[PDB]
Amino acid sequence: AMSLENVAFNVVNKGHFDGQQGEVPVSIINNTVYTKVDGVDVELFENKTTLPVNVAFELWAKRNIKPVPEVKILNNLGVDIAANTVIWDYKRDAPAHISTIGVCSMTDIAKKPTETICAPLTVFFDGRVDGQVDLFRNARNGVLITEGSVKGLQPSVGPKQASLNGVTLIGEAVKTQFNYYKKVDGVVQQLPETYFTQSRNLQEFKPRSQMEIDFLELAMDEFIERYKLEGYAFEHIVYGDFSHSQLGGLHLLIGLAKRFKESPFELEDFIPMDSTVKNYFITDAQTGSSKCVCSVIDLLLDDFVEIIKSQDLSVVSKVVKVTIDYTEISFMLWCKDGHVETFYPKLQ
Amino acid sequence: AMSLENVAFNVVNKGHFDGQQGEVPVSIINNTVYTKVDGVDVELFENKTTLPVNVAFELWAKRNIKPVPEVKILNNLGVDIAANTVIWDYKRDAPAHISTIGVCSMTDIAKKPTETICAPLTVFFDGRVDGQVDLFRNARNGVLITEGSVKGLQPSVGPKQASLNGVTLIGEAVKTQFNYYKKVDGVVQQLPETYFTQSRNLQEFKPRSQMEIDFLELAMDEFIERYKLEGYAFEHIVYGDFSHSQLGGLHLLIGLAKRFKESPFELEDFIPMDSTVKNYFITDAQTGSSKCVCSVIDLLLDDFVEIIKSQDLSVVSKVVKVTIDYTEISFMLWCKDGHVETFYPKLQ
Amino acid sequence: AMSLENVAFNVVNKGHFDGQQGEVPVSIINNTVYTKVDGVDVELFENKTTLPVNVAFELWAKRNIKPVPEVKILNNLGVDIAANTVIWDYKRDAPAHISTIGVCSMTDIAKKPTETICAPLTVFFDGRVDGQVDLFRNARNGVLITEGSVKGLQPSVGPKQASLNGVTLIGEAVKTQFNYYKKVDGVVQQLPETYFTQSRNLQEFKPRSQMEIDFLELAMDEFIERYKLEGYAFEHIVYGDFSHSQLGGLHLLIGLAKRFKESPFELEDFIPMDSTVKNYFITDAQTGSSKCVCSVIDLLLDDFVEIIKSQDLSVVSKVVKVTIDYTEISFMLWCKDGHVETFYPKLQ
Amino acid sequence: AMSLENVAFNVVNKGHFDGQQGEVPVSIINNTVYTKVDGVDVELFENKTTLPVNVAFELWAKRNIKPVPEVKILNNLGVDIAANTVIWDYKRDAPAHISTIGVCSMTDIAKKPTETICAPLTVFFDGRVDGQVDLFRNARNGVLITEGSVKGLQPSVGPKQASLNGVTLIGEAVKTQFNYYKKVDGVVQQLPETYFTQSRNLQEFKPRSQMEIDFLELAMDEFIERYKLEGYAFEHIVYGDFSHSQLGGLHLLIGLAKRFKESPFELEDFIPMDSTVKNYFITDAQTGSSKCVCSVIDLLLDDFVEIIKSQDLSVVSKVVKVTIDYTEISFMLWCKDGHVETFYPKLQ
Amino acid sequence: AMSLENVAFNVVNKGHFDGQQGEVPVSIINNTVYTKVDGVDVELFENKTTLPVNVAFELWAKRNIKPVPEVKILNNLGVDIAANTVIWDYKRDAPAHISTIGVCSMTDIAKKPTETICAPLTVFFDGRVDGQVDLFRNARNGVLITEGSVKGLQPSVGPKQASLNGVTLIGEAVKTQFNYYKKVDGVVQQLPETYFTQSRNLQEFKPRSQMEIDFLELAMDEFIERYKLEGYAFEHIVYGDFSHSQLGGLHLLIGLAKRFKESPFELEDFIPMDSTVKNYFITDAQTGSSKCVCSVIDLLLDDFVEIIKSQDLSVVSKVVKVTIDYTEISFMLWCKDGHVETFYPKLQ
Ligand SMILES: Cc1cn([C@H]2C[C@H](O)[C@@H](CN=[N+]=[N-])O2)c(=O)[nH]c1=O
Ligand SMILES: Cc1cn([C@H]2C[C@H](O)[C@@H](CN=[N+]=[N-])O2)c(=O)[nH]c1=O
Numbered sequence A, B, C, D, E: 001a002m003s004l005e006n007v008a009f010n011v012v013n014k015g016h017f018d019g020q021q022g023e024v025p026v027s028i029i030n031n032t033v034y035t036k037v038d039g040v041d042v043e044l045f046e047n048k049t050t051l052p053v054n055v056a057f058e059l060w061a062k063r064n065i066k067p068v069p070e071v072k073i074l075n076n077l078g079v080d081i082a083a084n085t086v087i088w089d090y091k092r093d094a095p096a097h098i099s100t101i102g103v104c105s106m107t108d109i110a111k112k113p114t115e116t117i118c119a120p121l122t123v124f125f126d127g128r129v130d131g132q133v134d135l136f137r138n139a140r141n142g143v144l145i146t147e148g149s150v151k152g153l154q155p156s157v158g159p160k161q162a163s164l165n166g167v168t169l170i171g172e173a174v175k176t177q178f179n180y181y182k183k184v185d186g187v188v189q190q191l192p193e194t195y196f197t198q199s200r201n202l203q204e205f206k207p208r209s210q211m212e213i214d215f216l217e218l219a220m221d222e223f224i225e226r227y228k229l230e231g232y233a234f235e236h237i238v239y240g241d242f243s244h245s246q247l248g249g250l251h252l253l254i255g256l257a258k259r260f261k262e263s264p265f266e267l268e269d270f271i272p273m274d275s276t277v278k279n280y281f282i283t284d285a286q287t288g289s290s291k292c293v294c295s296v297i298d299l300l301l302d303d304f305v306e307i308i309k310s311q312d313l314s315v316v317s318k319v320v321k322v323t324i325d326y327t328e329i330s331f332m333l334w335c336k337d338g339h340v341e342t343f344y345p346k347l348q
């Protein structure tokens, strides 16, 4: 028997929804869920979604608390709905998907993914839950993660990191690297070879290779020589140009990371959602240099170097498609006299 | 196991809360409670109270659906709280009392009136409920209604009319005239002799006496003659004076009713609540005569006659005090040369 | 180029969305849509739906303004979504269907019903629109209305009445009686024989048969005589029993209508939606008789007679099933010694 | 004469309510109080309570700005209401108590604590305000703080820290250590001997003894030897076990403090209120180790050592009651072969 | 053609309003603007103003993204409205001015500043926009900024810093020091000689002279001797007195900056708006010293020293008017025996 007061009971006594018997008095006022604790109302939940307050509350309580793929990954694979769990988008404070299966009676389009309503949707399945590998086999459309081989299914090895309760991390006490599988129209699909973005914070940025350590420690000229990068415009692309009114380049998160420890800047996240390429309106506090749409990607610098050096430098301008986080990312490559002028995630 | 979804199940299937088991999907958006019926949301309750929406929804669902005293009667006797029921105030679209006893978890102060937190409050007991007559006996402060005699207690006979689901009616298939008994600090009270307002509507006003019939039928001068009312200013007080900018008199509901059938007027009910005396901002549409605060009471005309004929007409102005619906109503009485000038419920 | 301001221009100038070009200043405050007219704000739409205010505003602006089936008829036939129109549900002040097709960008699931996302949904096609008869032929699941014959398809004749801008009427200057055709999984259905509710109002109730006239005019005993209805409990079932605390019978709208003209009563419409059977919490103001869930259907009296006279009166109680408005309505039939005791739409 | 505009006046010109003459134009929109400053609206207050916006505003303005006991302390002593002041709960952004005495006409259950309505409630009295010691003597239920001896009243010495405007601190320019007194039913109650939690932040944690300094500086093995703690499971209890998927132990705030300066973690405060024991859903960023209900207490480590070493280690499992912040805190003590396995605040 | 969906389009694809063709689906719910990105609603904007949500959204999108004067400066010059741009107040999350000219059809009092409605208002003009110097010449009231000389107009050199997207900065890639001009009633006004506040953060405070570097590094006694400040009460005025319950002095932001790096304090910004003098309710965490209205100004310490030493020290108390940010700031100067007791921005 689901109820608001039982959802609330579970949150108060178990920290999330955990299937327990019980009820607690709840008051709902506008978009906030409160519970009575010793005479006074204590806030349990502020609805930040476009769902009704008591609905968002139930889905948030019912959020998956195992490590799970980052929303950008699910999105890039075309996931529409999850089987019998909620993937909570901690970057949006909302569910990652509009509807549920077997979670919540207001949002459920089905109780079980085998119901035919679910066949046109890409259902996300979790091989760590009993029975879910088999439901993927029977689903017309789906994405499946597992911790091991599935007999006959050709795997795609996922990123090292996963999200655990909004914290992105490479697991040591828990597994966060999954096999990925995808089906379109009953047909298992070959996933493409791909790079993976590293999901690091500007605040907490830590290098993950010698080349990255070198980039952070060395001066610009010295790194560019040491890694034989002359003619590839890392001065514009990665390090950034703060000399003009429009801020030049600065498209690699490590490059922002470098600049941040000298002087701060403002980054307006004006479409705040998880995604492989992010767009910020950036203002440099030291110089006043700025740029309205500054696209930024967190590639391991090794990977970025590998990507740009693979390029034919003989055309003035061309679209360069690179597979990253399973999606195809377009870059613009501008060349002159066989050297790179600029190379950036193409603004769409 | 109280829940939002179970209360909603009871509403949907039984029309009101009925102790049934079951659940239905509920969504709450601002102040409105919806349920899903075949995939579309159906509005089930709009909160018009100062309570949280889900709390108000439950108390409304749990309203007393038997004929109960009108709220004005309960306020006049000083009722603070009800025993194991909710008296719903249909004039305020809200509960009649702040707290509850054995009704709802967010608003309960106790689960039985015997608890000590209740001793100071005047608790309303309904003799029609097994065991409440005996709870009243052991209650320190309380008001009690019954349908027949209570052994060892002299009764006060109530109004003929009661409220059944917001309809004020004199019961023919059910009993609406109660016995009333009251206790302060352990001591049964003698309730004062009292008149009762008649609780009638302007639109569907019916006379309840030959004098009231004669008043609706006869012309002004005739009536005042037949009942020897020369010098009592019923022209001003009951018939109303619409010849000057400030509307004159018109303090008796029957006199509004008479006027309303010939020509309409606005009654602005600026403190919308149940009360023995109502104040209206009246605009007469035919003449433009108006009055900001026109106090109005629905007394049986004969009772109003009896009251006005029992006053000393020999002082210019004074306060005249009348027990009505068990409360003391002050009237201003204005006289000149031993005839009435005006006489109106005091605007205090 | 769809916009909030253009939809508002269309409302202001054409009364509804009409494809015109133009813009007007719009402000949105909570759930209300305003436009500026000579420097003051004029309210243009109050959202009473679970949709976002601007989304609801647009779907309402885009409502079908031709006579369309009543929502109860469409629900009974299982319509999920409409083709390139919005059926507006005037009893719920909301759209009849969750999603749209070719109507509004925030709610569209497709732009034409031929798209594959639509195949599973029962799509409502309006033969009066060029090309929709042929879209229905190629539709997997669908309901279709037409004004005249469709070649190669046997029709089901609908109710005489349709909804034009929330007014349910039998059309004299326009046609309201449609042909109905239905398809599940590619296969044209034979629609069942059915009665149709009459969709009439308590206030403005008109008879549509000599029996209905005789019922409104004659006294109870006379009528029951003229039509040989001894032993069918029309006293209880149609005329209503107001002598006990629980109101007795009163399940036929014509019987409410008769009572309403002599004395009034409260009908609490606690699930306000369009449905073939309505449940009301009724309080009779003259007697105080009442019933929490009084199920009410507006059947042509003669049709109700025909139904009750076609039952086996020889079992104490059983479920009686009747096709009405294309859906199966369960009735409880209660009998003793071969006469009817009661017979009411099942409270299920 | 109280008014919204005068409350607002005081806040603008005095920083809080200070009894001053004056008014300023105020606008209220939804839950925010604004004032006009030179043409534009400036936000004064966002209602975060379950009270009406203008009510919460007045109570917040009227908040006590002297050092006052922490809400957890008042709660543990059963305080229901304060005499002639508002204790503002800065952890809840709301008043610590539902009602007032002599503060606010919407929330006042009385003007003065001697009114009999107040007798069943534990009224908090402030010996630093004239007359309040005497009101405690006359109150049927109460908690009193003073800065010195009260003749005849046996004191309880309180914690060193108090809250001054939401900042918890041990006063140097002001006194923050009070005597505590409590009355139940007219009878002064012996307060129990008790420990006091230290109220430190994870962010700003500072040790307060050699043992705490040693814990922060030394390695685990070294401290455990230096303070002769073998067999007491500080490895699990205080230091924490991040090696498994469920995070083990970690129940002392200093232990979290230690871990925080190496690698960060997430602590969801999912019942956000002041209390002696706090429950967090914790995710370790380095390892992915997590635990849904991780109870944490800030005891001076000396005190924790004193507590655990006092225990009989010869039973597999037993509840161990310790008085802390005047309340009785239950611990679970799990032992094996005369050494501690675990010891944690019992989850209720 | 303006529209909500086109404003939203520009924000999504350009980071702000940029005049581009296009539309995106938008949902508005209460005070938040959302757009659909791949099935889910992404928040674009939370209305923090007292304007309607979709209005504030448009004005915020249309905010000036060039360096512009700080709101405190515009306010001190009496600016009421801007010509054909929005100055966004990032400290209030709202437009700096109530109305617009040529920006937004809901807020526009005119299309062009020459319309006579604009003549009584001080219109802000931006010499960097074509045609705006000339509109200032024709305006009856106005404030104009330029980057260079305007023929015949006697300039006032502004502060070195400007606001670029909420970041206050002295421009290196962009110009942030403007000429200022003002007209009252058709008459260009002499702007006064003035000091300028430095607009630094407590968090990010950086000295800007040897004297400031000395103040931060030296001990109190040493600086006061080195800069020959005996008798001027910097001990009270600048350094602050935390020894009593009322916190003494502490009126220079650099003085707060000094204290902050030793021990933290709380500063309640209780009128949160940009202004030359700021008022904080300050609580010192170390000592519990506090003060309800502590006025603070960020003058370059050199300037403050220059100001106080200019004073006649022979009167017990006098108002001392100093021009700062073009406005006249009142100080109270309290002297005794020819030495300063206190000197603070006069509380009004
Ligand atoms: C307590 C609470 C939580 N959330 C949701 C969205 C946030 O990303 C996430 C919390 N992240 N962590 N740790 O949960 C919310 O929306 N409102 C609330 O009142
Ligand atoms: C359906 C609904 C009902 N009520 C309450 C208050 C009214 O006095 C009463 C309705 N009166 N009658 N018969 O019920 C409400 O407040 N909101 C709602 O949405």
Ligand SMILES: Cc1cn([C@H]2C[C@H](O)[C@@H](CN=[N+]=[N-])O2)c(=O)[nH]c1=O
Binding pocket: C044, C045, C046, C047, C048, C060, C089, C090, C091, C092, C093, C094, C165, C166
């Ligand atoms: C003007 C306005 C209209 N409606 C909708 C729902 C109602 O059924 C219908 C009006 N009925 N008729 N004729 O239109 C709404 O919901 N809010 C509004 O502010």
Ligand SMILES: Cc1cn([C@H]2C[C@H](O)[C@@H](CN=[N+]=[N-])O2)c(=O)[nH]c1=O
Binding pocket: D044, D045, D046, D047, D048, D060, D089, D090, D091, D092, D093, D094, D165, D166, E266, E267, E268, E270
């Ligand atoms: C200015 C403002 C303050 N408060 C309340 C709750 C916070 O704990 C406290 C502020 N704490 N400090 N310093 O006051 C609020 O709720 N809304 C508001 O707009």
Ligand SMILES: Cc1cn([C@H]2C[C@H](O)[C@@H](CN=[N+]=[N-])O2)c(=O)[nH]c1=O
Binding pocket: A266, A267, A268, A270, E044, E045, E046, E047, E048, E060, E089, E090, E091, E092, E093, E094, E165, E166
């Ligand atoms: C994204 C967003 C922004 N603002 C406004 C007010 C803030 O000062 C400014 C953002 N400052 N920076 N970088 O823009 C807002 O009010 N709501 C919103 O949802």
